[PDB]
């Protein structure tokens, strides 16, 4: 069982090397063990969403709504077919370009609100 | 970032992810479309095509993957074998598909599951 695909493959590849080293020499160097653990931690960190995306994906899983990871821009797709939605971190596929650009403009936002 | 609202540290946490998911899926609605998975030794393609035709009689856009290729509605979306999950993702991520019919051979299940 794995949690990260690359981390799981790396652990599977490293397990046989560790066992072969043990059967050949009786022990495994601690430096190599630490290197492998650091590589696994780096793989876990690399293939990790952000806390906002993590929370939203966890809520979607709790509600039984399917979710997949798109390969373009760290976008997450919820649902299937015509019933799907997309988020990046907090922007949804229904968030407007005009609203975001107006919010990014301090003076324009102030003028509109005034 | 709602990272300070789900863990205020001086008050009650708020379910921001729940509110976001309520906005994305208002009612008690998941994002699922009807999925019909056909498996078996000798009649997967014919049954898949017949199911696609029958559902096409209803006014619905049917995305179905068979051994001949992956079709959406009346038009061919992809050529090749297209009987594994790598082709099921194409149907399930298409914004126009309302019903998915997937021919699920044993090869795809063995290779990468459903």
């Amino acid at each position: 069982e794995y949690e990260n695909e690359q981390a799981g493959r790396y652990a599977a590849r490293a397990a046989v090397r560790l066992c072969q080293s043990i059967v050949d020499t009786g022990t495994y160097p601690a430096t190599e063990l630490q290197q492998d653990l650091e590589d696994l931690k780096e793989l876990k960190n690399q293939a990790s969403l952000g806390p906002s995306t993590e929370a939203i994906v966890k809520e979607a899983e709790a509600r039984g709504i399917p979710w997949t990871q798109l390969g373009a821009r760290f976008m997450i797709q919820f649902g299937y077919g015509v019933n799907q939605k997309k988020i990046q971190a907090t922007l949804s596929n229904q968030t407007g370009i005009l609203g975001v650009e107006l919010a990014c403009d301090k003076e324009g936002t102030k003028r509109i609100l005034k | 970032g709602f990272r300070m609202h789900v863990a205020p540290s001086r008050g009650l946490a708020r379910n921001v992810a729940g509110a976001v998911m309520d906005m994305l899926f208002p009612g008690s609605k998941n994002g699922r479309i009807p999925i019909l998975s056909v498996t078996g030794t000798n009649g997967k393609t014919t049954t898949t095509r017949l199911l696609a035709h029958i559902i096409k009689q209803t006014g619905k856009v049917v995305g179905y993957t068979t051994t001949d290729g992956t079709y959406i509605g009346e038009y061919l979306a992809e050529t090749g074998d297209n009987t594994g999950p790598q082709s099921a993702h194409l149907i399930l991520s298409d914004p126009t598909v309302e019903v998915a019919v997937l021919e699920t051979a044993r090869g795809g299940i063995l290779r990468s599951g459903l």
Binding site: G50, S52, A89, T90 | G1, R3
Partner: peptide, 4 residues
């Protein structure tokens, strides 16, 4: 930018 991102997570403002």
């Amino acid at each position: 930018d991102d997570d403002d």
